[PDB]
Design a protein around this ligand. Structure first.
Ligand SMILES: [Co+2]
Ligand SMILES: [Co+2]
Ligand SMILES: [Co+2]
Ligand SMILES: [Co+2]
Ligand SMILES: [Co+2]
Ligand SMILES: [Co+2]
Lengths: 330, 330, 330
């Protein structure tokens, strides 16, 4: 119910711009506790209580996938990348081409095997690849897919020891999950200031979902719950299963230091093993230091942004257990 | 029932040496038509009729996987390759570690993402990789896996248009399938000479299953039904769905020319679109020209030996439809 | 008597094709227990008991040396390599040129020292070298050596701590030793099935001694006792002195798995510290999976195929102690 909750949300396709299938399902499991409104741009916003705008929580729906840019003469699909993938993760891998008519499966096979003796033994760049969907010609392809349909990897699900979980799309699905688990566990409790949960769009392509929020939402403290890339010197003693991490500093922003304490305190004062770190990249929260106390805490992750992303199942536990015990005790 | 037959047989793990799980299941669906004997080395042999030994048919159970060679101090698994894989297909991919106690899942994640700035932007070699299984230490790993346990990729299944099929393990599973479909369709027909169906072991590591057969089985004509790697100049006008291919020539052997005719004839004379080709590598049949008329016919395949192998579903149809209409009309 | 037994057998020159001097001496110490026959090709074969052919044991006489291919105008010897040496082990080293007239010593000195200032600071390839034997001219050389005389390194002997031993030619001499020690310890015991000890030729150049055996000797289980190259990831937890190793898998063959157990069992059931491994290269045994249960067990070795090969003296102890306790209790 934590797993299958997770299996349920990684499986949903939807990269930046195209988050529909994800937020429709968030609404399936939210409809009947709390009350939503949907941004223009796309954002699920869900206030709790009324009054001055206190905390804001953001996990983003969109993920990294491929935009279909056009079609070849023999009906293979061209694509650009949306977000940040690594090409070696593109070569010879099933995908899942999402269209209007609905899901449709193909394969970025392109794998000239052992017996061709022009050995392309370097990594083959994202633009030399195409998707196979079994189309016979340029025409037959359009029967099935049009430009600006997008696609995503057929995602395996794996539970490693008993503790960990691997699949592509933890960034930031787990987060979307958390802010649901951690919203059912609120509301009827009510004793508050006034906290705003949000499910952002287009984070992986420039945070644009949260840059849109930054209007109408001037809160006091704005959090992001995205991933925390793990296990490099520069990650200090962060290791997996030693509880949620506070992105103190990344590449998008170095974050409020007093806010850091204010949670770190609530942390130990509340029986939790929060840990602290310095990584790379950025987080929706860093769209708010514009004017706002920002910080984003997260779960440390291995093999990030690959279909092998691996979060520890306890940290997730403790992290909702904290990003709740924040919305009160702050 | 052709698909799910195929889905059923690719899903079974078992690389060279370790074919058990595969032949036990072949026997589950053969037990009660025809009669088997199992080689020393491992081979399923199934005669039909009695008398001089006429034709021999071989599809091999084993596949390409990874042998676990040892364990690291932090409980990651080391492995060698068994067979011929390409390393770019090793990087960051779920696998499935088969042990004695039974199946156990892990991930060759190893994917230093975007934020480490020593960019290993070349392909990372098979020996710098390890499997993650979520073990905490060298000790905790052995609790789960021992050397000479082996592993295989979590295999997706994909049906491309309606026609084609992708998954890792068509080589030579489809073949194992064929020689089953095409053995249920025999026997009770009986009108013969005397044909031997065999399910070989260790083909992908030197044909050693069929090199073992070469004793006790001196037939008249020996066929192999393995893959036919496709879509390179040197493949002539072989294209997918234009019916089974006759490996005229590969790298292991150039095959009987009269036997080629003798089938090519039976082909057109029997309403089939056999095609002919020159590829690379070898086939169990080429363990018999030692003394024996050899030839191996097959289904053309794209993206071979990658988890994206793609055979056309008709060819398979027509190929059983022919490797039957051979066991009589030859 | 284990050492000097070993010192005695490494010292004997004889590479593939030219094993005489070795098997004559094996016969000096075997003549008067058990009874031999010598293959055409060269193999010492020594049955024990009579009846169905049960086990076969092979250690090979030949070693890596140099074939003299011709002679220079100033009476230096040209050579090819027989087997697999590494060139850096050729540069500037005494050798021992075996002729018909008998032993004759020379030196692959060739060592342009410090004062020539064209610095050949890369490794100098096997074909730029010649042997010095002190001959004054092309003519004077032939007075001493003719083509297809061969040569071998002057071999030092070293006993490292008290435990280990270094010298060039453990592969497979130690093995030849074992199957002698372990044949004097049989015979008069007699209680058997029927075991065949063999001393093979030409293993280091394609196993051709044992490929010749494969006729007339169809046994039930065929073992090889050759070296086991040691101390690389891919060698798992094999370390020196932790008892004989079972080559589970190498590059020539992945070996019977049930036979592996059947010894591993007899092992622990018999008070021995057998260990298991995956290395590279091959073994005479792998000439039998042709039709036969093959496996080769061995002693782990460091610095293999160099005049520094280093086996642990206990393992050798325990290995005869086991390859005896096999010839009965199997
Ligand atoms: Co994210
Ligand atoms: Co991300
Ligand atoms: Co195959
Ligand atoms: Co293959
Ligand atoms: Co040897
Ligand atoms: Co050797």
């Amino acid at each position: 119910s934590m797993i299958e909750k997770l299996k349920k949300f990684t499986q949903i396709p939807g990269i930046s711009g195209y988050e529909e299938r994800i937020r429709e399902e968030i609404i399936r499991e939210i409809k009947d506790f709390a009350d939503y409104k949907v941004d223009a741009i796309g954002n699920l916003i869900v206030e709790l209580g009324e009054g001055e705008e206190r905390i804001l929580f953001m996990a983003h729906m969109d993920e990294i996938g491929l935009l279909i840019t056009g079609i070849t003469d023999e009906g293979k699909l061209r694509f650009r990348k949306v977000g940040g993938i690594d090409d070696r993760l593109l070569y010879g891998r099933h995908v899942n081409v999402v269209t209007e008519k609905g899901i449709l499966d193909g394969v970025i096979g392109a794998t000239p095997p052992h017996l061709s003796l022009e050995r392309d033994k370097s990594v083959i760049p994202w633009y030399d690849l195409v998707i196979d969907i079994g189309a016979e010609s340029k025409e037959e392809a359009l029967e099935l897919v049009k430009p600006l349909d997008f696609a995503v990897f057929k995602k395996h699900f794996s539970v490693l020891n008993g503790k960990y979980v691997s699949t592509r799309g933890l960034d930031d699905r787990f987060g979307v999950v958390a802010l649901i688990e951690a919203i059912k566990d609120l509301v009827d409790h009510e004793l508050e200031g006034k906290v705003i949960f949000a499910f952002t769009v287009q984070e992986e392509v420039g945070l644009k979902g949260a840059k849109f929020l930054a209007n109408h939402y001037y809160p006091q403290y704005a959090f992001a719950i995205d991933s925390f890339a793990c296990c490099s010197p520069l990650t200090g003693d962060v290791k997996l299963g030693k509880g949620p991490v506070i992105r103190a500093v990344d590449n998008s922003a170095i974050y409020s230091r007093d806010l850091a304490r204010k949670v770190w305190s609530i942390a130990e004062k509340n029986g939790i093993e929060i840990q602290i770190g310095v990584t790379g990249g950025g987080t929706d929260a860093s769209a708010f230091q514009d004017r706002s106390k920002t910080l984003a805490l997260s779960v440390p992750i291995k093999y990030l942004h690959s279909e092998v992303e691996t979060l520890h199942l306890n940290d997730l536990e403790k992290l909702v257990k904290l990003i709740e015990a924040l919305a009160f005790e702050l």
